[PDB]
Each structure stands twice: as structure tokens, then as C-alpha cells.
Design an enzyme around this catalytic site. Structure first.
Site: not given
Lengths: 270, 277, 277, 270
Positions: C28, C62, C244
Site C-alpha cells: 500500500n 497517502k 489498508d
């Protein structure tokens, strides 16, 4: 064509007229509870001047288990419905689950209700239409507003023109209902009385939210409201039952909102 | 710095879910300086006679159109000039939306309320840069977010030091190319003790799928739940609006539309609250 | 400059809906330089023995977390350094996502495929700045957009002069806090004659509502429709992934997972196409 | 507990076993068309080695209009079903719409199908369970996967353990179905055979898309497939009927995919 103003003796139901209440309990728990609940409705609706039809099922036909309480059944319920009707001189509305039950139900019941899941079953619709009682169509969770016309068209083809459409929420993802308030206009444009079943639209298959939802629906201008109460909501659909001690202030606000909204000139914003 | 303001104040105007509803009203995009002045004058006069608190709304940029060549409006520099011109000439407050972190500070010079677009409501740098300006923040609730998820966006605004926060409903994705407004969602956002608004204009959209004829019914349903305010776009000729014309209210119908909502709001804000728990 | 490329080429790799599936696989977020190297080595070895074309994936930022304080990764400067380090050391292509127009050009120096995030897929300035770099563009299909709506985003990319375009499914909003994958949507995107990918990892999400145990069933269903590739995130210990983790595949299970999908893909790409119109 | 492997004489249905085909036509248009269609199915399934059950309704009970074609009706259909069964020695599956019909249908039909809209109606479920035929449960468009357990639990309470769950799409907004492939695992984890009705999952209440959807569903590993065909799809549900001339290549691909998928070791990714 269906009747734009549906008459039931003294009562007139239409989307431009004062709203009519189909009110009562989810299921006939006992004779004493049904009599007590009916007395409370009739008194309140009389003092607030809201036309009233008493509502209760004789059977909960679609419960999860075979052992769940279903009510008195056909024979006892129709007998019990007559007791309520004769003592109080109040109209009766109840739902019909199998085609053969339509005619025996029609003797006692002034409005016979077509359950949501069965609204497409032709044998049940034809048998219900034949009795010539008023037909309350529960709009299925899985049908769009415009799809209501076919249920009306099938009723008219079956020779019955006393028709009411009743909103009760639409499937929104899994285990959840939403009420699309834009759908009320589409059904009203079919020129039939349109009702809102606020009780079953809360379901998450939210008692504190019944006030919010009833106001939003009735603010759109509707022919009437479908409502269930119980003195102690904690035998069926108790999470959706309104505490009976709260009935009168709830109805009083809706009476006032309806009066305001029904007096508005319709506004064309095309 | 943990809690948001239940009553959001902007000079004479007070916004809260128990107070008379406030109108964020105007046009979708600044099509021209002259049309913006005409629209502002029309809203201001109507709101004064109906006694409705008012904030003028217009975008300076449509940042998310279908095509690279679609009409976007005057852009940052000129749009801020037109909003200030309207603000100074009419003595009216201003709300407009912000699309990139660098736009936040210059827009806040003129705009009293800066709007966080739905698709961008989770973008951390944009939320922070907006929070820093200390202007009021109008948070558009994304079509794909549930009501309880607004709590985190409030928290992010609070984390970045801004507590003048508004939540604004604008529909939820309902299958493909369709929005539905969950009226039960209003109670969840109100229990966060911030002013909650209803963008009836964009809740009519059928995105990629107009419903201008249903605006009154939908606005009545929403305002009957008892809200802090309404977000509305109008146009003298919606068929020729430069963006979202299918959802715009015909400007000539603004006054009868607001007149009904004014009485409905007064009725609803005056109801005794009822405990049904 | 009107049509997109049906076959997207990246050196030795060829991506198209009728060709052997390509894996965009990794983690991720760049949690650390050492973990990124370990994960890349593990994917590369497995894909070589199974003979699956491979592009390493990891985010450098992110940009849309719940909180201002949530872990975001190394950021632009350092993340680009780590991706280049991985690229040069392993001789592996790179895919990462881009969140602001100014990030597009520097990221494209290292990344061969630049990813357009779902929430931002309509933001015109970001789409244009990405198109300009002339890198391949991986378009994430937004949870709130219907399949036919991808055509406009392709057109906007083409308008800005980039025709190396991929569409990547990642679920559709299904009521509140839930995604469903409409497998019929794959045919609509394939008829736009671009490579279409499946992000099985993010299609498991229950956003604001994990489903890691269902990843194999879902990946099999998607790849059985016959797709150009798969987008996948793994982690040695998903409970501790920095973002995640509930949707990440256990890295130790990567090889048996890919082995099944490799045979399924070969079977499906070898079927005679059937006209049922 | 329900039977994990449901036996029907020679045929064994289970989610880890070779998939079984419930195949036929939407409605009994005529004796000649039904015989022709059955012959085509039996021959193809024999050469491809796919276990086969013939499917056709004797009544379309839930159409839009009272005048829409409904089929031969109960008496003629049950008689016609026996003609197909006796000549070909093939199992029969058909759906049941009213509780009384269950037992007379059970004489001829080896599997009786519970329609989606009626899956909650207790009287119909109890009467169907009593006949002791296999029960194919059509999963309602408005029910989430986990809700299937209650329909199983009610069947088990009613004394029947030969149960099959059949997916047919979920309501996705208005007038549209989506198939949530993640739902197959939830139903498979109930340890019953799980089938996929690809024909009715295309509906937009998409014939060129039947191939895509059937592959995705069968790639998850299923006990069987429900499919309808017609020589010229242009009397009921023709937009969803597969052109009969395309049956064999369609089934051949599914046979090959199933073989691959059924041989996979189940993989625990928790």
C-alpha cells in the site's frame, strides 16, 4: 382510469385534501390490547380532527421462523375485526396474503392491503380487486416509482378503481432502506391517493427518528399516513412501533404541517 | 481545540439547526460580471422582503468538468475580483468553493465561507490549508460517504485548528447515475452539534444519466426535518446556464419558492421537540 | 489525437485485454526502504517462476487519510528516491499514484505508470498535468461513477495529448459503507478498446463500515471475465500494515494465489470468443 | 443441519463437486417446443458429461398485466412435465407459487423452486418442504446473503434437508441488478449447494453479456448453474434467453473452467 379522490362513505382521500390516518398496531396480540389501542386512536383523531381508519393484521405471514407469533389467524381475526368495527363504527384496513382470503376479508374490511413482496402476484391482485373494497398497494422495496402504474393497470383491468399507493422505503445496499422523497411526485402524477408508511421505512432488515421521517414525507403533500403503535413496543416490529403515550403530540404536529403544506399553491418549476 | 461551534456566526447572521434557516444562494458559476450582479440583487431583495438571512454563492472555477474545453469560469484572479466587487457593492457575504491548497488563502480574503468540494473532502492538504485561513468551512458531504463519516472530516478540520464548520447534504449514490437523499441522515449529522445544510440543487442531479420540476417537493421534505440552512443555485434561463443548468431554479420563481420554505421552516423550528427513544 | 492505444507497451511488457494478464503488485505505502526492497524481491521472484509480467507498486503519499496525523509515508522527495532505488537495483518498472498537478512531472521521472486516484479522477488540472508527462496513466474508476462514464476521462486524457491509458476497477458504492463489483461493468470498459485492470484489493473494502479471507474468490471471478491485468497489495503482516491492512494479502500466500490466477487466465484468454448478440 | 451433498438418485450436487445444470426454458410455450428444447439439452449435456435437470415453469405468476401469457397452467403443465420426464428419464425442476400446489407438483417434479418474491412466505415454504422434494431457493433481490440462513432454518424446522440456494442478483439502485460475487462465499459457508441463475441476473427491470457473467460466477466454484434458452428468443424473458444454437460452445467453456477451478486447493487468506 383510477379514482383521483377515493371515497369511503364519509371519508375522502386525495393528495390535495386533508391527510387521512391508517393507524393501529402491527399484529392482533389480544382482544384487550386491540380494543385499548383503537380507543386511543379514535379519541385522539376526533379531538385533532384527522379522519381515521383502524389498522391491524390478522396474520404475520412472512416472519423468519415457523415458530414466530403470527396472530389469531384468518377466522379469529376477521371475527375480531368485526368486533372493533361494530363497537366503534370505524373503518377497517388489513392485509391479504393468499387469493382465496380476499372475499372473506372484504366482508369486514373496508380497505384490503396488498403486501409489498406479493404486489406482483397476479392471482392475489385479481382476487383482491374482485371484492371491490379499497386496495392499499404497498410499494415493494425492489420496485421503482414508475413501476407502480402496472399494479394500477392490472387492478383497473381487473375491474377495481379504488386504489391507494403506499410508500415504505427502497432497498439501499444490504439490510437497509432509504425513502426517495422524489418518488412521491412520480406516484402523485399518476392521479391516485399516495400514502406514506413511515413505520416500516425505518427498518434496517431507529424509533427516535420516526418524527423526522414522517415530517419529510408529509411535507411533500400526501393523501395520508400509515402508522403503528404499541403501549410497550418492547410482540412484532417493536423497534418500529411508536410508544402509544406519544401518539397525540406526534399527530398534532403532522396535522399542523399538513395544513400549511396543503394550502400551498402548486409551483411549476419546469 | 476539540469541539466544533454549534452556532456559526458571520456578523449579523447566526447559523444553527434550531435557528431560522439561512440561504446560501446564487448561481453555479460566475458566467459574467453583469449576470452575477443581477442575480445577487435579485436574491438580496427577495430575502429582505421575506426576512431570510442570505449569503451570495458563485464558483470562480469549475475544476471537475467532463472535458478539458468545458466552460470553467473566470478563474482565480478575476473571480476573486468579481466576488469582492459584489461584496463591497452590495454589502453581502460571500461563499465560493476551493479546489487546491494554494487557492485557500487568497480566496479567504474575499470569501467569508469557503466550500470543500465533495470529491475532495478527504484530501488532507486541502482540508488543512482551508482550515488555516480561519474562514467558515462549508463541507460538502460526498455522494459516496455515509453520514457518520462526516465526523472524521470535522475532526480533521478541528485538528488543523478551525471550529467554524458546516455540513451540507447533496445526495448519496443510489445505483448508477442517480442520487437519493436519505432524510434520516440529517439527524445523524445534527447530533454532531454543527449546523447542517441542504444543497437541494445538486441532490436533484442524475450524474451521467432534468429534475428541475421536483425542486420544491424535495426542498420541502428536507427543510421539514429542521435544518440550519439551504444551498441553492438559480439562473434567469437555466437551459443556457454554463454548468448544471438542468438543476438550476428559474430565477423568476425564486420568491414563491422561498416564501413557502420560509413558512415551513418557521412552523418546524417552532415545534416542541419530542423524545421517542 | 483521438483514439487510445488498445495495446499498452512498457519495454518488454504488453498490456491488453486479449493478452496474458499483467500484475501491478506491491504494497500500500512505502513503509520503509528495507520493507519495500523485501516486498519487491518477493514479487519479482514469484512472477518470474510463474511467468507473469510485473510492475512494482507502492505509494509515496497517502493524501486522503482519516486524520491529519495518520501515517502518510515518506512523501514526494524521499519516496521518489526509494522508487528509483528499487527501479535501478531490481530493473523493475514502477507504478505510483499522483495527488496534485505539480507532483506529476517529478514522479514521472521515476514512475513508468502514474496512477489517477478515484476521488480525483475528474479534477481537470491533475488529469492534464498527468497527461503531459507522457507516462502511462492508470485511471482508478471512482466508487461513484458508472462504467460508461470512464469514456469522458479517457477523452480528457486524449484531449491533453496522452493515449497510453488504462482503466482499473475497484468497486462501486452499494448502499452505505460497502462496495460491490459489477462484473458486467468490465465488458463496457473493454468495448472502449483500452486495457482494463482489476484492483481486487480495494474492491474488498467496507469503507467506514476485514474481507481479506475472500480475496481469492473475488480475484477469480474478475479474472474469469478476461482482463488485461490485476492490481494487488500485499504485506508480510497485514495487521500491522500502515494503511489498508484489512485488505492486504499475506505476502507468504502470494505464490499460490497467483498460481491459480495464472492458470485461470491462460484458460480464459484461450477461449474462442462467442457472439451472443 | 442441511445436506452438504444433495443427492437426486444418480446425481450429486455440492460446491466442491462437478457442477450440475438446471436448464430449459422460461415457460412452457407448447408441447413441441418443450420436447425440442429438452432433446437439445440432454444430447449436449450427455456429450459434454454435465449432469442435467430439465427446467420449465408451468405458470408465469408475476407478470405485469393480467393478459400476459402465463403458460399451460397447473393441470396441463404437471401433465406435460410427466411427458418430458417419462420419455427422456430426466429429472424435473419447476417453481411453486401457492402453498396448495406443492404436493401435486411434487408427484412429477424432483426439485421444486421457491420464487424470489415469495421466499419469505411461510405457508408456501412449509407446504413445499412437506412434499420432501429437493427445494431450490431463489435468493430474493432484496435479501442479503447472510439472510439465507433463516430460509434454510425454516425449511429444516419444517422437516426438509434437501436444500439448494440460487443466486439471481441484488437490487442496485432503481431498475437494475448487480451480482455480488463475494456473496457466494457467505452462502457456501452455510454448507449447502449454491447455484447461479445467470439468466435472471442480467435483468434491468444484455444477452451479449451472459458469457461474461456465467464465467465470473462459476469461477468462484459453485455447485451448479441455472440457464434458460429459446430457439428464437424474440414469449417471455426473451431478452435474457440464450439462442439455443449457441448452447453447446457456451456449456463447453463452463465445463472446462469448472474443471480447472474445482481442482484448486482451497486457500485460506484470513
Amino acid at each position: 382510469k383510477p379514482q383521483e379522490v377515493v371515497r369511503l362513505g364519509d371519508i375522502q382521500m386525495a393528495n390535495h385534501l386533508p391527510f387521512v390516518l391508517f393507524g393501529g398496531m402491527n399484529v392482533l396480540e389480544s382482544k384487550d390490547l386491540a380494543f385499548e389501542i383503537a380507543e386511543t386512536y379514535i379519541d385522539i383523531c376526533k379531538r385533532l380532527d384527522i379522519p381515521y381508519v383502524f389498522k391491524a393484521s390478522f396474520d404475520k405471514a412472512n416472519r423468519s421462523s415457523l415458530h414466530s407469533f403470527r396472530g389469531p389467524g384468518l377466522e379469529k381475526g376477521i371475527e375480531w375485526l368485526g368486533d372493533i368495527k361494530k363497537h366503534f363504527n370505524v373503518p377497517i384496513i388489513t392485509d391479504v396474503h393468499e387469493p382465496y382470503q380476499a372475499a372473506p376479508v372484504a366482508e369486514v374490511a373496508d380497505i384490503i392491503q396488498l403486501p409489498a413482496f406479493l404486489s406482483r402476484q397476479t392471482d392475489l391482485v385479481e382476487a383482491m380487486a374482485k371484492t371491490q373494497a379499497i386496495i392499499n398497494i404497498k410499494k415493494a422495496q425492489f420496485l421503482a416509482p414508475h413501476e407502480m402504474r402496472h399494479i394500477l393497470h392490472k387492478c383497473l383491468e381487473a375491474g377495481n378503481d379504488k386504489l391507494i399507493l403506499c410508500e415504505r422505503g427502497s432497498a439501499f445496499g444490504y439490510n437497509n432502506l432509504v425513502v426517495d422523497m422524489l418518488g412521491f411526485d412520480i406516484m402523485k402524477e399518476m392521479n391516485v391517493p399516495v400514502f406514506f408508511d413511515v413505520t416500516h421505512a425505518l427498518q434496517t432488515p431507529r424509533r427516535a427518528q420516526i418524527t423526522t421521517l414522517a415530517r419529510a414525507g408529509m411535507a411533500t403533500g400526501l393523501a395520508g399516513l400509515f402508522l403503528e403503535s404499541h403501549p410497550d413496543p418492547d410482540k412484532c416490529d417493536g423497534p418500529s412501533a411508536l410508544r402509544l403515550s406519544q401518539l397525540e403530540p406526534f399527530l398534532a404536529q403532522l396535522k399542523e404541517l399538513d395544513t400549511l403544506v396543503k394550502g400551498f399553491k402548486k409551483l411549476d418549476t419546469h
